[PDB]
Amino acid sequence: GYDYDYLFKIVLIGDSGVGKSNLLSRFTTDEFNIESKSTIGVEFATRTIEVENKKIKAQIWDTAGLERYRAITSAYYRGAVGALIVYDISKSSSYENCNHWLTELRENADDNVAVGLIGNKSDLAHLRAVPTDEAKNFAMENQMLFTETSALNSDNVDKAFRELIVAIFQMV
């Protein structure tokens, strides 16, 4: 990793418990943590991927519990060129709160940010509370990419991040 052509900062946002921290770990180091306690703070991790023979350092940010800390929250969004809004396919509240997250993006992130919607925990299909076609339509109406993922079993995680990175690449 001596060099890279671009660095794309991407923020993960969404309700607590949906799997953001595990999406970060699954994508960056192929790791998953079954632990149900949220870490209060901010972190980032990187992975380099290739798009059209260009090396892109994807710098993936994750946070919890700092919403009342203004400067840190500002720093969280600062410079982000992509965002993934994450809900839990088994928890309708997390999906219904996606409009809040879109609004947070509009109010805190740069105008040009490329956005993907992720319905995580697809392995909990027996507990599904959000129909795929409904969420897919909501994503389209709001100019968001859409993927259902399982951070737990890995399903579609690389796809969700890659598609967004390709989309960021086309814009810039």
Residue ranges binding ligand GDP (CB under 6 A): 16-22, 33-36, 38, 64, 120-121, 123-124, 150-152
Residue nearest to ligand GDP (CB): 19
CB 150 within 8 A of CB 122: yes
Minimum CB distance to ligand GDP, residue 50 (Å): 26
Asked if 21 interacts with Mg ion (CB under 5 A), we say: yes
- What's the DSSP call for residue 123? G
Pick 59 or 63: Cβ nearer ligand GDP: 63
Residue whose CB is less far from ligand GDP, 30 or 50: 30
Nearer to ligand GDP by C-beta: 84 or 139? 84
Taking CB under 5 A as the criterion, which residues in 47-86 touch Mg ion? 64
For 18, the enclosing helix (H) or strand (E) is: none
**Backbone φ, ψ for residue 85 (5° rounding):** -95, 125
Q: Which amino acid is at 134?
A: E
54 Cβ contact list (under 8 Å, min separation 6): 5, 6, 169
CB of 129 to ligand GDP, least distance (A): 14
Which of ligand GDP, Mg ion, none sits in contact with 151, Cβ below 5 to 8 A by type?
ligand GDP
Q: Which does 79 bind (CB under 5 to 8 A by kind): Mg ion, ligand GDP, none?
A: none
Enumerate residues 1-20 that contact Mg ion by CB under 5 A. Answer: 20
Least distance from ligand GDP to the Cβ atom of residue 49, Å: 21
Dist. CA 52–CA 65, nearest whole Å = 37
DSSP class of residue 38 equals P
Q: Which residues are within 8 A (CB) of 161 and not within 5 positions of it... i.e. 6 or more apart?
A: 10, 27, 47, 58, 60, 84
Closest CA to 87 of 78, 100, 76, 75: 100
The site for Mg ion (CB under 5 A) is made up of: 20-21, 38, 64
